[model samples]
Target: VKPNYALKFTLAGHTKAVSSVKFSPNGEWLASSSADKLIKIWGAYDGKFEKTISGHKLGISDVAWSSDSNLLVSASDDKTLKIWDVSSGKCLKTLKGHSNYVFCCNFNPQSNLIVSGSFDESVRIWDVKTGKCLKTLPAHSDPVSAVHFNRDGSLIVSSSYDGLCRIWDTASGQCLKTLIDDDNPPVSFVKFSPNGKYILAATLDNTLKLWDYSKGKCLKTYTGHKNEKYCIFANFSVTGGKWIVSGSEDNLVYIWNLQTKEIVQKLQGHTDVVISTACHPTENIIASAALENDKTIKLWKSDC
Candidate 1:
């Protein structure tokens, strides 16, 4: 039987598969993207649909909110990335340049810069204010699956289907580190630790590897997933970087202590693959999306 967890709210409306969901920096709004080719904004507290932003001709692969929560960015299989006004529900800017599907995108924490990864095996840095492609870094030989800025907003980390994780200088666009694990089996996602010192990479080999970015070393590995992995989503705890919450295709969300590398708890509710997960910026609350078993999205909370 599943654990007896209380339901915070149930958000409904998407008629197709929901691919990505994230909370605004202020935790006031929730944004979701789906195969239905629509982006949705929701009242985070009440699960009320605030507005719908639409334009993509294909499925959206990922969505992100700006630091101030005033704008939303979405990457779609239509080979474009769009910036939208959260309040106006209008497409503010459409960035077009990728030769193939754009997979993921995130806004810089401190600037009007946006970074996007694409199936074209390239990553582009965009001037978010002008909708201009400032620079394109062709690093990965295969599709770039994920891209994100570190907490300090000084560096960017990208993971590719080529089985490599790369760290790049956000300012100079220089490649800082190339992390490869011959035994890892294939990496699906890479993210920086909230403290900006470490990186956690999830692999299809059913293991989560932690790396010390400063020394370019693998610090530890956590294994628990039972089958091939689809994604690894994590966020630091609100109290501090003392803990991390991660979800996997194993159909579980695992909470771990950062300092000791110990599993604190395993959150289970989804009966199938959990593809995406996000944590609220301030509260000890988390949200996850599944691809199977009715295609459900769930919310969980921790007292810590």
Candidate 2:
């Protein structure tokens, strides 16, 4: 990873611990969800408020933006995942199925389908057109923490508190890979790189792991932060996936060199746990969120 810039701004909007923040695929809109039971939309670079989405009765868990960026999907502890029409600021669908809290979801731009994970230990596939549960898979014995799809939407990956990350063939609903590590702690989050060459998993053991998932190998383990219980996130840089950036319960964000497996840089500002982190889809900028008192979303852009 190469160094270019530093954090330049902070937007103090969320009232509670911010859970997740994601950029639209076109890199125009930034959608942030919080434990405050609200979602705020912002202009990605200028720090301008664009819209506010409010409907859930409890804290939000995660959020995703459609490939076209015209729609937004949010998973909440209210036991449902809501799809919002970004243009009208209205919820178009309330996907219900999980008997427990909905923790994660991702939109498959390649199709009119969505994959979601929940505390009920189930992973559900939904049809965007019909708003019906297409498949209800008993993914694990414990709460499912995260779920994501590959670039072509052929394979889906899901992680659970049972200390497992399962890769499933989306077409056949068969488990293709069952990834486990030596530590085998509860995984907090998992995601595929933009190029679909690697997978990154954040765990409760205060470590971030990189995997050459195709080869069934755990490439490296990055440690040194305090993310004990909450489901925090980590992502690959848009610059050829050269770097990895993640939020910390230690009140900071760290960037690591993907190949060298070394700390490239550390940015500090938040006064509490930095729980949410995201990279711009097409730009060399990053966004982060912190809670437990800070309750702010901070942005950083390249200086070089």
Candidate 3:
């Protein structure tokens, strides 16, 4: 069946590149991070601007919301991560430890723990409440790119310019498994599948791979997008894992059938690199961000 996705609205507020866009878990707000050293929250339903969160000394790399939706954690080139009170637009705590630019971060299921990767080549685990760096793992041989906590909070996965995605034991900070492809292209982004049984990883080689994390094997590769130049994000659809969506350097967003691997749709309208994307938690909606050439976030709605 063909998926019909229509543009809902385009939002512009950031002065520089839009780096990341995500919907809150409670599905009430959309959080976006940008290279302009700012974070903006918008009404998820109508794409209306709600708040601007500014404090990072440098460009913000990623923004993740807590499960309850009252908090947000952001990573920055300033070499620190900050937890924010979403309602008041206040920085609640600053997590500092990475020696270089902080690249990606994610809060665990409970929203009490955080995992982040940095250009310093390390992955860090932090206690959200105390603002303490709880554990540090010499994670990769090169700059670490993305890090994510699995559904249950027992595992963390990190990808890097080192061309490896490593799974870690959350409790002990031990490396459990390392996943790398035969070509060993730099991995730009990665996320655990909704079911928590697999991983979807975007590599710099213009390919997205699905891997069985437990068995350390690649199960499928999804292509047809231009992503060899920049780090872009790809994710499974929110309502159900029926489709895979990714931003492309070719100025389009591609969606594929999860099981059949067919290119189901290509979202048009951006004039530059599509850098990051986020799916609504329980709706057939999507949010995509572009680089400085576009500097905009577009929301899309799909009729099921």
Instruction: Determine which window of 10 residues in candidate 3 has minimal summed lDDT.
Output: 233-242
- Indicate whether candidate 2 or candidate 3 has the larger lDDT: 3
> Which regions of candidate 1 deviate over 4 angstroms?
1-6, 182-184, 227-229
Q: Estimate every model's Cα lDDT from 0 to 1.
A: 0.80, 0.87, 0.92
The window of 10 residues in a row where model 1 has the poorest summed lDDT is: 1-10
Better of 1 and 2 by TM-score: 2
lDDT of 2 by residue, 1-304 (tens): 3666477778878888888999999888789999988999999988788888988889998999888888888999999999998888898999988899999999885748899999999999988878899888889999999999999998889999898988888877888888987778998899887777788999898888989887889888887778888888898885444788898878988888877878877888899888889988777889999986898999998732
State each candidate's clash count.
0, 0, 0
Q: After superposition, how far is residue 220 of candidate 3 from its true place, in Å?
A: 1.3
Off by over 4 Å in 2: none
Candidate 3 colliding pairs, count: 0
The alpha-carbon deviation from the true structure for residue 141 of candidate 2, after best TM-score superposition, in angstroms, is 1.2
The TM-scores of all predictions, comma-separated, are 0.92, 0.96, 0.98
How do the candidates rank by lDDT, highest first?
3, 2, 1
Please write out the lDDT profile of model 3 over residues 1-304, one tens digit for every residue.
Answer: 7578899999999999999999999898899999999999999889999999999999999999988998999999999999999999999999999999999999999988999999999999999999999999999989988899888999999999989999999999999999887788999998899888999999998899999988888888899898887878889895744899999999999999888888999999987899998999888999999998899999999874
